[PDB]
Amino acid sequence: KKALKVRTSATFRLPRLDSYKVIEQPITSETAMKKVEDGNILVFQVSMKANKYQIKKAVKELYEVDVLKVNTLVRPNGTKKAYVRLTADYDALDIANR
Amino acid sequence: MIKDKDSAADADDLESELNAMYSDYKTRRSERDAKFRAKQAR
């Protein structure tokens, strides 16, 4: 005698990027320095592999300042420029002289 | 869950199931074109 079940299934299924690498050098053109002096915006050159989170974190770690916003663009010569606007508690000119 | 065993009736049922499966397979493979369905209609 064999005990086999009646209810059978209808289908059978098978059972190197740190703070010193992120920020390469600042931008010291007259427009960038004007932004530093007036708009409280530090202009930096950053690596092409860095996003806004990494740029903000790197600025915070290296320069000990609070970053309000970061706006990045890619320059025609294959390099990335970042505008970092700091919080009103910090003066960008003081950091630039430092 | 049925607690019964049959000697040759099981073989007959298995053969009938296999024949039905083969017939269904033939019908499914043949009904790929509507010409066959039209011919089988008449």
């Binding site: 209808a10 | 073989a11 298995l14 296999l18 499966m21």
Partner: peptide
Amino acid sequence: LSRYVKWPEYVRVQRQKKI
């Protein structure tokens, strides 16, 4: 329909050889 999916190929072949 096409119920043949309830049996895999190897089960079907090994039961066909039984007959």
